[PDB]
Subunit: 268 residues, 4 copies
Amino acid sequence: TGLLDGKRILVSGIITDSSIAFHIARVAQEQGAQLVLTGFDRLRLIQRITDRLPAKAPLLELDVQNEEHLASLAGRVTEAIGAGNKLDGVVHSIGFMPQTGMGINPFFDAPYADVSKGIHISAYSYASMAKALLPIMNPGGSIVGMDFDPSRAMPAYNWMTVAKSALESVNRFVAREAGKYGVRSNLVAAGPIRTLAMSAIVGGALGEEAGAQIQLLEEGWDQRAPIGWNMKDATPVAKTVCALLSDWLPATTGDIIYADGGAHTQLL
Amino acid sequence: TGLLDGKRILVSGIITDSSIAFHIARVAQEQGAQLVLTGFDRLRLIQRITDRLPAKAPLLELDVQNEEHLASLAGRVTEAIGAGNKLDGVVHSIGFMPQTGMGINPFFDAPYADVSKGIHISAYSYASMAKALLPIMNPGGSIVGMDFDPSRAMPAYNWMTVAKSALESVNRFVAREAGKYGVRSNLVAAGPIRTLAMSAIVGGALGEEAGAQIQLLEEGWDQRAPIGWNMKDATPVAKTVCALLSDWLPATTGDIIYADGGAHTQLL
Amino acid sequence: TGLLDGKRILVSGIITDSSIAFHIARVAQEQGAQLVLTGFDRLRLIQRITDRLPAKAPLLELDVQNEEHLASLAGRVTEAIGAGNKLDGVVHSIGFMPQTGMGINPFFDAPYADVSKGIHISAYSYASMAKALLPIMNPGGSIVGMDFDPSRAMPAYNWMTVAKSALESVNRFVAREAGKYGVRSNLVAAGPIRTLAMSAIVGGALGEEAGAQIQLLEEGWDQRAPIGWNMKDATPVAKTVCALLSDWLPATTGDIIYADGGAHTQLL
Amino acid sequence: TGLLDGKRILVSGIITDSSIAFHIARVAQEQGAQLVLTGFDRLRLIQRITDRLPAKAPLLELDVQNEEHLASLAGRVTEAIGAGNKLDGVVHSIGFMPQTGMGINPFFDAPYADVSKGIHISAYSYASMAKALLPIMNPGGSIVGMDFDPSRAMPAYNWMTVAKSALESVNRFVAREAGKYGVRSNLVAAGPIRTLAMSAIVGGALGEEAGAQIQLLEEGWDQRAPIGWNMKDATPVAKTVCALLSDWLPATTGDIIYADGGAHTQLL
Ligand SMILES: NC(=O)c1ccc[n+]([C@@H]2O[C@H](COP(=O)([O-])OP(=O)(O)OC[C@H]3O[C@@H](n4cnc5c(N)ncnc54)[C@H](O)[C@@H]3O)[C@@H](O)[C@H]2O)c1
Ligand SMILES: NC(=O)c1ccc[n+]([C@@H]2O[C@H](COP(=O)([O-])OP(=O)(O)OC[C@H]3O[C@@H](n4cnc5c(N)ncnc54)[C@H](O)[C@@H]3O)[C@@H](O)[C@H]2O)c1
Ligand SMILES: NC(=O)c1ccc[n+]([C@@H]2O[C@H](COP(=O)([O-])OP(=O)(O)OC[C@H]3O[C@@H](n4cnc5c(N)ncnc54)[C@H](O)[C@@H]3O)[C@@H](O)[C@H]2O)c1
Ligand SMILES: NC(=O)c1ccc[n+]([C@@H]2O[C@H](COP(=O)([O-])OP(=O)(O)OC[C@H]3O[C@@H](n4cnc5c(N)ncnc54)[C@H](O)[C@@H]3O)[C@@H](O)[C@H]2O)c1
Ligand SMILES: Cc1ccccc1Oc1ccc(Cn2cc(C3CC3)nn2)cc1O
Ligand SMILES: Cc1ccccc1Oc1ccc(Cn2cc(C3CC3)nn2)cc1O
Ligand SMILES: Cc1ccccc1Oc1ccc(Cn2cc(C3CC3)nn2)cc1O
Ligand SMILES: Cc1ccccc1Oc1ccc(Cn2cc(C3CC3)nn2)cc1O
Ligand SMILES: Cc1ccccc1Oc1ccc(Cn2cc(C3CC3)nn2)cc1O
Ligand SMILES: [Cl-]
Ligand SMILES: [Cl-]
Ligand SMILES: [Cl-]
Ligand SMILES: [Cl-]
Ligand SMILES: [Cl-]
Ligand SMILES: [Cl-]
Ligand code: NA
């Protein structure tokens, strides 16, 4: 039996088939969920990527900086899943930070206009998605967002670290609001996964130094993780997200589940 | 159907049918697990309690202060589940602290002999159970222990708070050892549940309930929890434990999952 | 002898004589420091307030959203303290959040334009001040910022909680940069102090619920604090800040010192 | 001049002139404090070491496992400082763990008798010292203990990590008791310092693995620390402790100050 049988779940943040969102969606479908997908900017490309999922699913446009998309989202979703039906799950797998706020680019030289855009998309949007979608969410439902442990500073993650620290704070306030609908809000702090963003945005910002990033990642995660960590395998992260969409973590909200091989609990 | 289909799991710490362990066991069985149970001291009584579980399960004696029980445990378990079979899960739901280290008894008046006994049973035993049982645990398996958030001091929990702080530290070292077997070790920080032990904390069971205690708990948990907290319902805690015994939190180890209605993420 | 004898220190964020910054400055002067002050918007008013300090000190205009002020700040400071002299200390005591992001105003109804302004002033500005002033800071020097524990969500603080979570993350990255100059960067997480911002901005946002605020504060701080907490006394906060400006916490950086009566260490 | 002028302070835990306690005591005396010292086992040796302090100070025997010493301590101290006088400060710089609970010795092979002794000395004793001495402590006074960040597991520290996790929990409860006397209780989480215990107890437990591990530590605490870290220099730790004994952190209790160069705030 599907862990998510007859749950209607919204999954944002697919762009390639390496995306964490893609694998969340794949696993969710294997576990009996009906999906609704959202995508940003490259809709024909995303469409061709989502056809590779095990089952057909509607795809809607959502740019989280666009007030009109947010205002119309609930309605467009209602249309896709049929009137008098609702979502049981929502997955926020979205992030962005301009090259100026990342990599070897000095921390101090990122102008606030750039930092602000990143916080808008990576942090604020968790609240605006919640605002838009809670009115069409069943009791017992689950909102989930993706996090990267920002509790200690680190090389290269720079201003995205600050956005994630903001996200953790937003998640806790969303939990309060979501509570009134009988809905949980949580984050998954994933270990590093080889995705588009990782390689092109993050590694891109190191240009010449890009080997250095792999040193940090090997050091901070697989070496520290008591059960190891594999950057080429999003499945453990995807399953962790599905666990939170399920009924099997019913007492957990405003919280962060670490899907990092346990790396964050070990110093060396 | 079963979240735990054909998993062989050991559950310690049943004494009444209010015990967290009893409900862990109940839910695990509903989810297709074959169980082995352990009990302390009152074996005939525990036996009569465990017959009330949905399915028959073998019951072994385990006093975690007794080196001979620990040395023989693996063997006795192997006998119960059949040679060439192994455990996929182990649940530590055990605790004790002498009256001197809890309730209105002044913190400074608890002699070390008493505190030591409590730390032995409540914290050290997590490691000694792990030591005894990992040699008969399959890769992919999960050890789980019960925690009560000791990160801030509080009235009455006194020296048990210290034992729990110790337990959290032990759990992280057990994760390292368990890692070598492909096994996860985690704690569930549960909210308050009306159990035998809980009533023994202030003034011994059989007393009227103890108003100050009940108020503190409602204050610290249901009021703070965005989704509420019900002390008479162990199901949400039991499900959280089963999620960690399952394959759906495969990347999480050395860690603490909060099953507390989200109370620990809200200040008031 | 002055704890801060012959230290040249910059203190931002004075607006009334209740301001935390005013008391930081007062205590610093009592302890032998030469000060340079910065103020926002109401310069004639601030000037009349700073004349009430024990000693004369130059006052400069600094609006942290204004790139020209930031670009010229180092120069204007150098002029005030004399060429070939430098700062040993910098105090960031600055914050802002539009009423939409605070109080009874629904969390989800604060538009990002408003939240962004608050994060700019309350969080980003810590970095931009550091960027501007480190080039004129002696080795052994100390940057300090003011924090309000955002690790758990709470009523009313709303989007300022998010700004503070961001600030904590920024402080850790500023520490890295400051390190290369032999300079420490830390935050003081203060308990509640009756200041202009507290009463007019925060209490203002509750309008008709403003009694609620005083109750929550007494509940979260004085009741929990083992040594008590007095909202009408900024001295303990000011002294804590001076300790970090001094040579007596030389091994502490990227960190948070709690000046809250110990409230954050007790559950209730 | 003195940060600690006319404060009467008790300093435990001197055994060599590399001991953290020795440097705490030295700095405290330079800052105008009258000291009372305590020592374990090797009294003639400790006596010859304490004569190297800048000023004469009485030396008392205290083995924290000995109930008779604890019962008589307050009286013996009163005798040393003169009747009708009291302590303003108490410093716990004490620790022990048998070789079985440390280094390359397997975590699971440390028998509880050994772990218990270490927790007794390293954790419980903080409370028993407090119990014995609070009755002779002035309002405004400060108790301080030494910590090593146990919040993440690590190689070699093993069961001492568990003792430190216990200590942090005890410190929070001692704060509550100390509060009733107007007294603060806090810990200093120090970075690594080359002391007798470090080299003989900890390094001893690595035997063959020893030299490499000391070099790694000096490299990594220092590499992570934005202001660096020098294991041969206890002054920064000693000053941090004096700051807590002083009047300049009056709002901090039940808490942990990190004197680690900021290493704990940086991931790499
Ligand atoms: N890759 C990792 O190692 C890793 C680890 C932890 C957390 N995360 C987080 O996981 C999430 C997914 O990232 P990923 O690595 O799978 O990357 P990805 O780059 O494959 O996906 C990021 C997504 O953000 C979307 N997005 C960007 N701007 C948007 C906007 N304005 N409106 C809507 N969508 C927008 C993109 O369309 C894309 O689908 C992000 O929150 C990221 O921070 C990534
Ligand atoms: N009830 C709650 O509110 C709550 C909440 C969070 C955590 N916990 C923890 O959950 C666990 C179970 O508590 P519970 O309240 O369900 O209690 P309980 O009613 O079962 O009380 C004690 C249990 O520990 C067992 N035990 C005691 N000493 C033992 C020994 N020497 N060897 C083996 N077993 C021994 C007893 O048989 C019994 O099963 C404990 O670790 C407790 O601290 C309880
Ligand atoms: N009062 C409390 O209970 C409390 C508790 C903890 C922390 N804090 C923090 O301490 C700091 C000081 O606040 P306070 O309570 O003393 O308040 P306050 O209202 O007296 O001061 C706020 C200050 O912010 C300044 N400011 C606002 N926008 C600015 C800008 N663009 N550029 C420069 N300065 C600007 C104002 O001029 C004023 O001096 C803030 O960061 C606040 O968040 C306050
Ligand atoms: N050395 C470090 O790197 C470091 C770092 C962080 C914390 N600490 C802590 O600092 C404290 C001092 O350790 P140190 O490194 O300075 O070591 P040290 O061995 O020089 O001093 C430890 C002290 O413990 C005392 N002691 C042991 N058992 C005792 C008992 N039964 N009764 C009384 N005293 C007893 C010894 O007399 C000795 O003075 C300890 O708590 C240690 O864990 C040390
Ligand atoms: C989607 C996204 C946009 C902008 C920045 C990061 C983004 O997602 C992540 C991608 C990879 C990672 C993992 N990662 C972090 C790093 C830091 C360089 C050390 N390298 N990899 C985290 C993310 O949050
Ligand atoms: C098993 C056990 C032994 C001794 C003390 C407590 C024990 O289990 C618990 C039972 C209830 C709780 C919850 N709790 C704590 C309190 C104290 C009032 C704070 N009341 N209930 C925690 C436990 O660890
Ligand atoms: C009475 C009571 C108070 C608090 C929690 C559960 C309670 O009910 C029971 C108490 C004990 C028992 C079984 N039991 C255990 C014991 C020995 C004390 C171990 N005696 N009886 C069953 C209950 O339903
Ligand atoms: C400077 C400032 C601007 C906007 C909002 C708050 C500001 O400073 C603070 C004032 C009071 C406090 C403490 N506080 C918090 C609250 C909320 C009611 C819980 N009331 N006071 C923190 C601040 O950061
Ligand atoms: C006093 C003492 C007794 C038993 C064990 C350690 C003791 O003191 C310490 C000495 C050094 C340190 C710091 N340290 C710990 C480690 C781990 C080996 C990697 N390296 N350095 C901490 C202590 O608590
Ligand atoms: Cl490891
Ligand atoms: Cl997996
Ligand atoms: Cl019996
Ligand atoms: Cl009692
Ligand atoms: Cl109840
Ligand atoms: Cl003596
Ligand atoms: Na460094």
